Amino acid sequence: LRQEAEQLKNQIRDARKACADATLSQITNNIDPVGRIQMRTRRTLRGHLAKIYAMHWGTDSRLLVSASQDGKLIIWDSYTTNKVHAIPLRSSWVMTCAYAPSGNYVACGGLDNICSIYNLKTREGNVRVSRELAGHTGYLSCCRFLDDNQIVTSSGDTTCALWDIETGQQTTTFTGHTGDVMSLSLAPDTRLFVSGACDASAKLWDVREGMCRQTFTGHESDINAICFFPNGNAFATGSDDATCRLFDLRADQELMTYSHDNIICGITSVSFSKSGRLLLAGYDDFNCNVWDALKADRAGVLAGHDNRVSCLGVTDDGMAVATGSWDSFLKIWN
Template sequence: MAPKDPEVESLKAELLEIIKKCQDDQKQKADTTLESAVANVLNVPKCHLGSNKILKGHINKVNSVHFCGDSRHCVSGSLDGKLIIWDSWTGNKVQIILLRSAWVMSVAYAQSGNFVACGGMDNQCTVYDLKERDSAGGVKMTRELLGYEGFLSCCRFINDSTLITGSGDMKVIIWDLEANKRIQEFDAHNGDVCTLSLSRDLNTYVTGSVDRTCKLWDIRDPTCKQVFFGHEGDINAVYYHPNGYAFVTASEDKTARLYDIRSDQQIGLYKKPAGDPSFTCCGLSISGRLLFCGSDDKQVHIWDTLKEQHNGCLSGHENRITSLSVSPDGMALVTSSWDNSLRVWV
């Protein structure tokens, strides 16, 4: 191990002191707490979701899943080198797409249902047109987005012609898919960009990173709007609140957190009652009242976001849960796992 550079260590200490000062200033300006503000709000009923469908077809770890805008179909990506389009209502496979690289880490389904995208350790993002066929009869690959200097960690469609990606080279890129060119490219974090989440109006988005910060961005401007601190480990997932004024996170530091954009700070902290799992993914119910976090302990943990109370667990997977997606209509939740399967919870 290389010896520590005294100058670097001094700068790190100075940075931590600045962050602490900012957090102290935030606390001084906070005129109430979430707990006291919702003291008169009734507790949410116990959440009872059942594993309605078990989606089997992959023969290796499933790393990512994402719902389509129709709240029925979803796409999953696995280390078996396949994307599978599923009908979550019936549990049937709709299409299977063979990938050039098996090291897929992220998938995205366009809200229109016309396109899917994926990427991972191949350092590129590949887009497929589900309505077109190639000469061999398979789903047509329309774009290979190249030029990344690190793994592709996350991708989301803004619309059928615009895609946003985050990667291990610390960058965020917004692509014009029709012109096959970059609209924006900028250094977003001081570490790998692990996750991103779009607001419902598609004008803003939040990113999370191994640098332990979350940042708020505007699609129309590459300048960071806000930075959020608090986590003590890698931020594995972020999820925009349906009201557009907050977002939740899931982290390696074994906590999930709720950040309020208007007050520019963390207002909720969620920990598992017992055990010591890291959280890998997160999502919110359509009302924003229930928080779902997948974890290393094979379960999805549920909290009441207002009361910060643990509300139960979804059990059934036999290995680490890697990803979850809440259907746009709020009626279902789909999870993926290293047990080679997906589960639909309703």
């Protein structure tokens, strides 16, 4: 009956408690603090006329794609603040965007339950739709390219699906969440990915096998953002209860919590740095926060914006940080 499930859930907690010998508070005591760090808006990206919910950095750390409610995808240069491309979307209700690792495609999705892939390099000189993905009952919230012809999508129907662009059909379907799935993050080796849901829980998936490896709890509110550590052995979680925390895949625990009494708003986007000792979180009180990510102490504030910060992103070389917001502006910090 259901007694075995309760006993197994109790014993997995007992096994979890048998490994927590030292939390991530006493291990890092002799380490020098980062200290106060200041970033200035090197570039401001104007051209959007509505709320921005998603931005993605290119692989070359120069190009950038952003989405907004005006039915527009804009590709920026970010060095000379030019606009490489402007892609009009059929559905103006978009909440996610992606950039292919090869630089040949971009993806978008939202309330229309449709993931669209656009070809950026055609002989005709214009960007056109290459494939449309259908099969999600709920609205899509995140999409990330695995390779040139493989994408993973997260929707609001408590499911995650692995697609094949060539045939336009679901290759693998990931099920097991009891709430709306909000965020996705791909591992550096592109063999695993983590998923955040509105059931206050996140779990690790396997792309090849197609089944969940482990699940992580601890939050008491819906998860909004997720991202791995650069080494791929850890990931950070953002939720609406003003708390960010870090989980370890090998330890299957929660390491440190990044919270403060002055903050009561929710976290919308998170992102690490190149070395991993700088976690950046976008909050709902109109300013980003910069965290030590190893001592749970704030070390910077990005207060340039005048509305809710919705998306964050660092470059692959770590040279800059791009943030979007609900005031239709993107700012490059360095």
